[PDB]
Amino acid sequence: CPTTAIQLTPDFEMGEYKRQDLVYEKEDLLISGPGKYPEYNFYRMAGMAIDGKDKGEAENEAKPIDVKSLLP
Amino acid sequence: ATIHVDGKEYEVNGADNLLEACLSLGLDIPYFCWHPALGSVGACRQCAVKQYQNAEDTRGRLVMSCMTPASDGTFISIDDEEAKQFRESVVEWLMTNHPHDCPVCEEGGNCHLQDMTVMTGHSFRRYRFTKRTHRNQDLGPFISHEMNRCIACYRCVRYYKDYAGGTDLGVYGAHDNVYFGRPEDGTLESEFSGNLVEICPTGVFTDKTHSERYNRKWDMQFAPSIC
Amino acid sequence: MKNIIRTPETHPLTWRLRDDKQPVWLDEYRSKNGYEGARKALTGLSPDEIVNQVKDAGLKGRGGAGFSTGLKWSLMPKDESMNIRYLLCNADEMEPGTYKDRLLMEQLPHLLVEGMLISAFALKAYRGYIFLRGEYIEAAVNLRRAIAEATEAGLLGKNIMGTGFDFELFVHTGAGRYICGEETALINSLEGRRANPRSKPPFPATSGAWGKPTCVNNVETLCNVPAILANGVEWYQNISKSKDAGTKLMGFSGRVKNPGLWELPFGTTAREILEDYAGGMRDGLKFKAWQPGGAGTDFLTEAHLDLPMEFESIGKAGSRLGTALAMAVDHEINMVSLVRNLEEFFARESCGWCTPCRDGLPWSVKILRALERGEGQPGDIETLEQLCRFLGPGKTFCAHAPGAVEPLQSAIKYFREEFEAGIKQPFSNTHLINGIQPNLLK
Amino acid sequence: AFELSAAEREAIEHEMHHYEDPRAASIEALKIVQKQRGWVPDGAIHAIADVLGIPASDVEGVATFYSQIFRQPVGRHVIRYCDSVVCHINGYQGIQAALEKKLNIKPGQTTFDGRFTLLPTCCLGNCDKGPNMMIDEDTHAHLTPEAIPELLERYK
Ligand SMILES: Cc1cc2nc3c(=O)[nH]c(=O)nc-3n(C[C@H](O)[C@H](O)[C@H](O)COP(=O)(O)O)c2cc1C
Ligand code: SF4
Ligand code: SF4
Ligand code: SF4
Ligand code: FES
Ligand code: FES
Numbered sequence: 001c002p003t004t005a006i007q008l009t010p011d012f013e014m015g016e017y018k019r020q021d022l023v024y025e026k027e028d029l030l031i032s033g034p035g036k037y038p039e040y041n042f043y044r045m046a047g048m049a050i051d052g053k054d055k056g057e058a059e060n061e062a063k064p065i066d067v068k069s070l071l072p
Numbered sequence: 073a074t075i076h077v078d079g080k081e082y083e084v085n086g087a088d089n090l091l092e093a094c095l096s097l098g099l100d101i102p103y104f105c106w107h108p109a110l111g112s113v114g115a116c117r118q119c120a121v122k123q124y125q126n127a128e129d130t131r132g133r134l135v136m137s138c139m140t141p142a143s144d145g146t147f148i149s150i151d152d153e154e155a156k157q158f159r160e161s162v163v164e165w166l167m168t169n170h171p172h173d174c175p176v177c178e179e180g181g182n183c184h185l186q187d188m189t190v191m192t193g194h195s196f197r198r199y200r201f202t203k204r205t206h207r208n209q210d211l212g213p214f215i216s217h218e219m220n221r222c223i224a225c226y227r228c229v230r231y232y233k234d235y236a237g238g239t240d241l242g243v244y245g246a247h248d249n250v251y252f253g254r255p256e257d258g259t260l261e262s263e264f265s266g267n268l269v270e271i272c273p274t275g276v277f278t279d280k281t282h283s284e285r286y287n288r289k290w291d292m293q294f295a296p297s298i299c
Numbered sequence: 300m301k302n303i304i305r306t307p308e309t310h311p312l313t314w315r316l317r318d319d320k321q322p323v324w325l326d327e328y329r330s331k332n333g334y335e336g337a338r339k340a341l342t343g344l345s346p347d348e349i350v351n352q353v354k355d356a357g358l359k360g361r362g363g364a365g366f367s368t369g370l371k372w373s374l375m376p377k378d379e380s381m382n383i384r385y386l387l388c389n390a391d392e393m394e395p396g397t398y399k400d401r402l403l404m405e406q407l408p409h410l411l412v413e414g415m416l417i418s419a420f421a422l423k424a425y426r427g428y429i430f431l432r433g434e435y436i437e438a439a440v441n442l443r444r445a446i447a448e449a450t451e452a453g454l455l456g457k458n459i460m461g462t463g464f465d466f467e468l469f470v471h472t473g474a475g476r477y478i479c480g481e482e483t484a485l486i487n488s489l490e491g492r493r494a495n496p497r498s499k500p501p502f503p504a505t506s507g508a509w510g511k512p513t514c515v516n517n518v519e520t521l522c523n524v525p526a527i528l529a530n531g532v533e534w535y536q537n538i539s540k541s542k543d544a545g546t547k548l549m550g551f552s553g554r555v556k557n558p559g560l561w562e563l564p565f566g567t568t569a570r571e572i573l574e575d576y577a578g579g580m581r582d583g584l585k586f587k588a589w590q591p592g593g594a595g596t597d598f599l600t601e602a603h604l605d606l607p608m609e610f611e612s613i614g615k616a617g618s619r620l621g622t623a624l625a626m627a628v629d630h631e632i633n634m635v636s637l638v639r640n641l642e643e644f645f646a647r648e649s650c651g652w653c654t655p656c657r658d659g660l661p662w663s664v665k666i667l668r669a670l671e672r673g674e675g676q677p678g679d680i681e682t683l684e685q686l687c688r689f690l691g692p693g694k695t696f697c698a699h700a701p702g703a704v705e706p707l708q709s710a711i712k713y714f715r716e717e718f719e720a721g722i723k724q725p726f727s728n729t730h731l732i733n734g735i736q737p738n739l740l741k
Numbered sequence: 742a743f744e745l746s747a748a749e750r751e752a753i754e755h756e757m758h759h760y761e762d763p764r765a766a767s768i769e770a771l772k773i774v775q776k777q778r779g780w781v782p783d784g785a786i787h788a789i790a791d792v793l794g795i796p797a798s799d800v801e802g803v804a805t806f807y808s809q810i811f812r813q814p815v816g817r818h819v820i821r822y823c824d825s826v827v828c829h830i831n832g833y834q835g836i837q838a839a840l841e842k843k844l845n846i847k848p849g850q851t852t853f854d855g856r857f858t859l860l861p862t863c864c865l866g867n868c869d870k871g872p873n874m875m876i877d878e879d880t881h882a883h884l885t886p887e888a889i890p891e892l893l894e895r896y897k
Contacts, residue, residue: 002175004734037734047171047205047220055205055220058172062202067245067805068812070860071849072475072647114498114696117654134693139498161689165658198678200728201665224651233798242798243493244805246476247649248657255786255801383761395825395864433772433809434865436878469759474768475809477863491760491767492799493806509761550869552827558869594826594864626827626868640829644863650806 003042007035073144076127078151086144090137091119094150101137101150102159102188104225104273110235112138116225118162118188122152134158156192163194169203169248171220178216178282179275182289185223188273204248212259214266216280223274224250231271238262252276300575303561307332309538311526311546312519313562316406322441325448328409334454336529340417341462349421349528356527356535357544362389362480362517363592363621365610368524372422374504375512384512386424387489388415388521390431390438391473391480395594395644397622399548399560400518404431404438407522408445412468414521416454417528419466422514427466430485432473442470477648481697482515484650495652496697519548541566543609551577553627554584560624563608569625570604580629588628588713592621594641595702597709598628617709634714635721638707639667645703655690656700662686663707670721677726680718683707743784745792749773753792764795767803771810780811808862816851816858818896821875825864831871837861839886843893857893 001007016022034040049055056063065071073086077094084093089112094101104116114136122132123140124147134155137148149155167189174180189195206219229252232241240261244251254260260268268277305314315323315331325333340349354369375384388411392400404411415427431439446468449455457465471489473479479488483497486508507513523545527535535545543565549572550560556578563572569591573579580586588598591608597618606612610620628637646660663686666679687704695701711718729737745753752773756766770793774785781804790797804810820840824833837848840859844852851858867873870882876896884892 037732039733042175045172046176047173047203048176048218049208055207060200060202061171061205064205064207065249066207066813067249067251069849070808070811070813070815070858072246072808072861072863115653117694117696120694158689158694161659161685162654165654165662168658168662197728198682199662200676201662201669224654224657226652239796240798242796242802244802245651246806246808247647247651248661250651250657251805255797256783392866393863396827396868397864398866398868401866432866434875434880436880472769472772473809474772474807475862476807488768489765490762491765491795491803493802552868552871553830560869624868626830628830632830637826637829640824641826644825648863 004035004037004040007037009035073142073146075142075144075146075148078149084142086142088142090121090135090140090142090146090148092138093142094121094137099150100191102163102191103138104184104188104223105227106138107227107231107271110227110230110271112136113226113230114139116162116223118159120155120158120162122149122155123147124149160192160194163189163192164199166223167194167197168199168201170223171203171205173218173221173275177218177221177275178278178286179221180288183275184273185221206251209253210257211254211277212265214280215260215268216278216283217253218276218278219251219253221274222250222252222276224252225273226252227271227273228252228268228277231267232262232265236262236264236267238265241265305562308530308534309546309564310562311530312403312407312410312522312548320406322406322408325409325445325452328407332529333409334413334525336525336527337413337416337454338460340528341420341460341464344528346421346423349417352532353421353524353527356532358520358523358527358535359543359610360517361519361523361547361622362482363394363595363619365620368516368520371504371516372418372514374502375422375514376505381512382423382425383509384422384424385508385514386415386419386422386427387482387485387508387513387515388427388429388431389480389482389485389515389517390429390435391477391485392435392518393432393477393480393648394622395641396552396590396626397593397624398552399550399622399624401435401438402560403518403522403548404435405441408438408441409449410522410525411442411518412445412449412455414524415468416449416459416466417524418514418516418521420462420464422512424512424514425465425467427468428489428508429468429470430473430479430489431470432479433475439470439472446470476650477644478650478697478699481699484697485515486513493650495650498696539564539566541607541609542611547608547623549608549623549625551589551625551627553589554581554629555579555627556581565609566607566612568605569608572608572625573604573627577627580627584629584631586627587630587632588634590626590628590706591618592623592625594644595619595699595705596621597705598634598713599709600713617712619705633671633717634710635667635670635717638710639664639671641706642667642703645699649699650697653696655695656703659686659690660700660703663704670718673721673723675718675722676724677722679722680711680715683711683718687711743782743788745774745785745788746777749777750792753789757793763793764799767793767795767800768807768810771800771804771807775810779817780813780815814851816855818856818877819858819860820893821860821862821865823863823865823867823871823873823875824861825868827864827868828872833872833884835886836872836874836884836889839889840893843890857896 103119119137121137123135124132208217211217232238269279307314350372358368360366479494484494488494503513549563552558613620642664646664649656669675687708690700690704753770756769757763770789790800865873872884874881
């Protein structure tokens, strides 16, 4: 995982009655916190712009310079 | 024509350049700006090999295999040390400004830049400064534009303008701020604009229709069919 | 030395310069041996004879590369089916530290016009273009006035001197890029395109401007031509006892007493120029370095001040003669700051075509900025040396990046202590990610 | 929005007469429009492309390649100070500091009244008389930081 999303946690009580019930969907997996990695955010690294992070606001990124700028 | 690559002797066509001759022989030379249909221009400087004047030459000289004819009795080396370091350095120079985008990039697993980065053996980053960024353009319903991932290999403009005859794509700007796209937002007018998603070796131009329901290339089930 | 006796035999390019620095127009130019070489060339010599005379005179290119002009002119095709040949005058002069063509075009435009006329008759070129930079307003005005005067006098246009040779001269003003001075990029910018250079072969002599045979020559080379054709080949060989024939505009700039430009024979000592002509360094300043031929040349020290200003003599010293307009660096100048300024110029004047220049000059700029701020890290100087090794000739698409890495190479070679003093913090480009133990390499 | 004037079109066609290929007049067409209007807007790119018979992408690539063709609005007077190596030796940084103190702008910006725009530029070919400045068409040499306010108030 390049985002530390999927994690294996110290829990072993997972027995079931039917085998179809061992198919865990997204609502059965998505916990409310960061798990074992408390601070990492992939979208703070990626250059792809999302809400709250426009171009140039990721880590180690300069602001975009338009080709129409007067500076050489 | 007779060429000698890394001590081995090969019979090639003299009308071909060294890159296409060596690729036809199964040898692996990294390359970006050359395309079999578009010709050679010598932009990306990735296809460097070491050419010797004769058999009894030990110094040699770094040349671009796409810009060098595969003439008779041509002595070159691909696995030469200095050529390998230069190709790795070209990959590193491309990697200095490249965004940390592979998980959220539609080219991932189908990306020529990823393959050539792995092929040159470059995996360690020592560049510590900022990366240049670019604003994207709206290119219509078919092609999605992500200008951050560009390596300035000029394949898109050469295909679109010289090959396909299109008029609304071009290269703008200057030194390290080169921008490949349209002069303004709008749909790409060419009837053959969709080939940019395979012409572009990075994830700048991607299939937007595929991007709506994206999956990786290894997860695909393919068949040979007729349009 | 200030008392300079400028004779036409010893100073063929500057002997008719006026004392008030005013331009010499057509009547004053023709009053002093004006268009005599053009008349002799167009009325008594074959174009092949003129090309052979220029080749035998040993005239080399003054634009920086030093290639011989006669061999460049001999590369043109011989067939009559190609007769749309072009002559281009590289009046760009955008290399920092170069100010000679400005003087030549501002005060002696008719010398340039006569040289273009002779070279166009020799090259059988029906059209000439002066690719001039846009910052030279007075040079453009004077060149256009001189072209109008020569067209009025019958020296330009249709049936020049009754020979039957047709030649028109245009002035194409530039739009402000240093890469336009490169000859193939000059051809590209003349065609109204982005000024990317072209791969050679083919050379412009076979397919240049608009696919036609084309010869690009510096202003000073074309200004050297009419003296050769008016005074003779043996006169041109018998003015300097050096391997480079003829005179050359040489100067010294910087914090010297008398910065300027003087026409001197080849083989003149750089120390001779700096002391006699430039007057030495200013008061309280000690000489520490010099660049022989502009911003794209290697730095040399005070021990190299005694070698003659020739192509080969500076070639073995580890530098290039270049434009032969040297620049002096005194002890008050930080070499890291100077090389930083040079590399910012070279990185922002890249045309963007090829990877090593475009993506490796900004890396060197950022490293030099870090060394300037005292924020250098280990491996920075090794990265700079790797950049100089991997941006040499053949590695990049044109010669802009080798000229870019020459001063960085020479400054690291000589003044390494300042670059080592720039490094003050340990190497790091990884943040600490909580929950992940790092791979502590050794 | 944009429309080329009669003088602009006539000058562009007269420059088109001087070349084998009409594409070769693109730089001077952009410079003509810049001289008339201060800079080159986007409609100027399209109009020059229509007059010259070349695509607008080529005109825009030319306009954004060359630094002296302005694709952004500038002030009434363009100060262009040399930041190259000989003027760095001769002390251009004092001149730049004096200009920034007098105009209260960064290099690459325009003053609030639209009177001055400050730009670094490459070597002006006047290195023996450095440091050098280039206001709209006038080259000023032998600059000192004390003479900057005197030099700036003669350009209204
Ligand atoms: C980056 C670069 C910039 C150059 N700039 C100029 C220039 O401004 N003026 C010039 O005469 N030559 C310049 N040259 C040299 C030309 O390529 C060419 O050698 C010259 O213009 C004509 O050759 P000549 O010296 O035989 O006359 C430059 C070369 C390079 C690589
Ligand atoms: S273009 Fe290739 S290397 Fe770049 S982010 Fe996309 S997959 Fe990764
Ligand atoms: S957009 Fe793609 S094809 Fe065009 S220059 Fe950039 S990497 Fe090459
Ligand atoms: S070295 Fe390469 S990118 Fe740099 S100016 Fe020359 S061709 Fe352009
Ligand atoms: S593939 Fe040869 S330089 Fe790009
Ligand atoms: S370095 Fe400033 S005018 Fe040349």
